[PDB]
Symmetry: C2
Subunit: 185 residues, 2 copies
């Protein structure tokens, strides 16, 4: 029985992701503190042994106040910018096309999930697909070929409901500053 | 404790996948019958309501006999071709760099998995990443940015150990034929 609407994804959680940007072939790894109630999300990039990028950023997105802070974790050199952009939660729009349900993982230790997309018969390809657990409606994976081939796959994990540490949305001392554009060296 | 070697993935199973080709933005959906012992894999593309592609193929890959059959499921018009290519199982090479372990899905209904890649500090980006379950070492997802930006993400599910139906590797009557190149209309 094809669901009449998608489950409603959690509004607040702390978890970790891997964002795979195809444009560049890069996997960023991140710890994420997510809050759809306040329309704010904090992403702390993660470092691994013997990677060639010198630079790692914490991002703090505050859509309610239309600004994003971006801190180089090493130098601490902040970067306040504006956000023109409308907030996009990690959930499933109510107009989303159901696609499938299946069990991930082998017999015994497995788990049922669901696949939705923005497929409509008008267009050749989808621009969104998401997989979410059946029980709690947690995000597992999304792909968003947004803006003509700037496509990303995102994987979510170690999710844990709610927010133990709200301090992390408070931008640090060094953030009474300006609008640089930082990227990875 | 960083694993000294990766678990050994199953050699035979019947499951289903979604292959996301970025070049084109297309998700193919498929049923798969996989056998690393005989180095052969049969992929039966799957149809959904109100997609705009008219054409759907069953592929039968027989690496031990260096040939691939390709059947249009509608017209039945076969297409035997040669395979120059070395077989690549769905597993984790023993020289693979461990990356992480984490739980997919929310509290209660979740499942531990593992992430490996072909990262070495010599090269900026990975060209392979795979996620596999911890218990049974089942494939969950891979991304293989092979050959300079011909990158794919693959998701695996409804996997079930072993092969109930070996008939499917036997090419049909209409396959005493030749080497067309078929693609989707
Ligand atoms: Xe979203
Ligand atoms: Xe997509
Ligand atoms: Xe996805
Ligand atoms: Xe991708
Ligand atoms: Xe592989
Ligand atoms: Xe990759
Ligand atoms: Xe992956």
């Amino acid at each position: 029985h094809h669901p009449v609407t998608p489950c409603e994804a959690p509004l607040q959680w702390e978890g970790r992701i891997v964002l795979y940007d195809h444009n560049t072939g890069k996997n960023t790894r991140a710890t994420v503190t997510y809050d759809a109630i306040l329309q704010r999300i904090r992403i702390l990039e993660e470092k691994k042994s013997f990677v060639p990028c010198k630079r790692f950023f914490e991002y703090i997105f505050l859509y309610q106040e239309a600004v994003m802070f971006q801190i180089e974790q090493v130098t601490k050199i902040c970067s306040k910018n504006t956000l023109t952009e409308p907030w996009d939660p990690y959930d499933i729009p109510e107009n989303s096309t159901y696609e499938d349900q299946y069990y991930i993982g082998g017999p015994g230790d497995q788990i049922p999930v669901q696949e939705w997309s923005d497929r409509k018969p008008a267009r050749k390809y989808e621009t969104w697909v998401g997989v979410y657990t059946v029980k709690d409606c947690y995000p597992v994976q999304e792909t968003y070929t947004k803006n003509d081939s700037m496509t990303t796959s995102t994987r979510f994990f170690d999710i844990k409901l709610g927010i133990s540490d709200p301090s992390v949305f408070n931008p640090p001392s060094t953030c009474e500053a300006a609008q640089p554009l930082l990227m990875s060296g």
